[PDB]
Design brief:
part of a larger assembly; 2 chains; A: little secondary structure; about 0% helix; B: mainly alpha; 2 helices; rod-shaped; virus
Chain lengths: ~50, ~35
């Protein structure tokens, strides 16, 4: 029963009618925010006299 | 313990308004201009 039963082609359209756009490019921007905290102090407890 | 100048007192809080509130938040970017 040796025979060719089917095939596949590598055909493609020409987009002269702009039917396809493929991938789209759009600009984006991300923003990060880093506020600065305070930190516990160090104290020098001298006498007042 | 200074004496107050109470006779005629005129306040202006706008002068004391923090510089932060004199404009909007400045992070704004046009991504199309930067790339």
């Amino acid at each position: 029963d040796l025979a060719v039963i089917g095939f596949e082609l590598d055909t493609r359209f020409t987009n002269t009618n702009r039917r396809q756009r493929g991938h789209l490019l759009q600009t984006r921007a991300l923003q990060f925010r880093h506020p600065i905290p305070m930190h516990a102090p160090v104290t020098l407890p001298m006498d007042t006299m | 313990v200074s004496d107050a100048e109470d006779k005629n007192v005129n306040l202006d809080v706008g002068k004391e308004l923090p510089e932060q509130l004199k404009d909007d938040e400045d992070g704004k970017v046009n991504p199309c201009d930067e790339v």
